Design a protein around this ligand. Structure first.
Ligand SMILES: [Ca+2]
Ligand SMILES: [Ca+2]
Ligand SMILES: [Ca+2]
Ligand SMILES: [Ca+2]
Ligand SMILES: [Ca+2]
Ligand SMILES: [Ca+2]
Ligand SMILES: [Ca+2]
Ligand SMILES: [Ca+2]
Lengths: 114, 114, 114, 114
């Protein structure tokens, strides 16, 4: 199934933050309406917060997270969870190798802000 | 129901990261086996990271997130989500007022690391 | 925080199913736009299905689950989870006593159908 | 990533329930410790409960859900969510065709019981 794709409410600010847990350098791209809106990278085996940014979901509300290592797409897992019918988290994990820890880059999207 | 309390596997490293979205200064305390292990404080209405840390769950695995504003506890909402039977997120939102956006401090715990 | 309240897409069929795990007879009410749309009542300590129904979310999309035992409201916990940006679960647990298992009535709402 | 595989606490009763939403007849197999423990089949486009059973997770705690339609494996999506650190849901959706609704067979596992 497709993973790392989320429909947000239109014209809404959201946070996106990425964490690294890998010997390989992670690159995280965040697309809004199919155009890159943020890119983060780093290399940590201790959960470094390699990047954070505030974005707007725009007219479409379509947000996509992609992760690559050495130019090769990682395998993604994702879900969205909503608490008290108000607080939203879109969650992504990724695997760059064979150990299947799926933490090599972790991406958290949250809304609303403010 | 109790919120913000999570049982992690014992003796496991985990990440904890807090974001703020409120005019009030947020104080996030993270307890491991009922003792304060980390504390983050800050103010933002733009989802700023007010702190991040890596902790060990210890012998009990018991982790609790508390959120307060000027010493008064916020109302918490939380859940744990597990992707591909491996990647864990413990998620907390909090409300310091009446608008019920539950984003005033947002706390993300993730494991495993490395 | 309020629990057991969910905003569904409008005019959408959804499933609602209730399970019981308690010495007490559970009464589950499902409200659509603040009006009772289904009521399930039964008793089991073995996860028996006490009711299942397909309902329409109507013009508002507002769906609320209430649980009581001998007329006393149970304490609720809830969340919504979305898989592959398409498959939705609205999940409710409830506690009628002191053991905090939160399984006394378990309610699963799923959509889309068909 | 692997989907439909869950690690439950050992020697624990759990509920497993399957719903159908497809023109094709669904076959759901539930494995405990790699051995078939339950099997459900049926056709519905109205969320019929094609099976519900209480099983024991045994010494391993390993539970796997497989879904097929006239012998062809469906593509699976899955996640686990835990509410109030007590109430567990393991969720599976499946796609047998081209529309990517992922509801063709829906399987919900819940624990603890009683
Ligand atoms: Ca890895
Ligand atoms: Ca890793
Ligand atoms: Ca607020
Ligand atoms: Ca706020
Ligand atoms: Ca109980
Ligand atoms: Ca019970
Ligand atoms: Ca389908
Ligand atoms: Ca379908």
């Amino acid at each position: 199934a497709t993973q790392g794709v989320f429909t947000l409410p239109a014209n809404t600010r959201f946070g996106v933050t990425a964490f690294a847990n890998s010997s390989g350098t992670q690159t995280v791209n965040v697309l809004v309406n199919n155009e890159t809106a943020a890119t983060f990278s780093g290399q940590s085996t201790n959960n470094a917060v390699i990047g954070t940014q505030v974005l707007n979901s725009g007219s479409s509300g379509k947000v996509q997270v992609q992760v690559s290592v050495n130019g090769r797409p990682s395998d993604l897992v994702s879900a969205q969870v909503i608490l008290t019918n108000e607080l939203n988290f879109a969650l992504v994990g990724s695997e760059d190798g064979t150990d299947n820890d799926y933490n090599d880059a972790v991406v958290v999207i949250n809304w609303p802000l403010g």
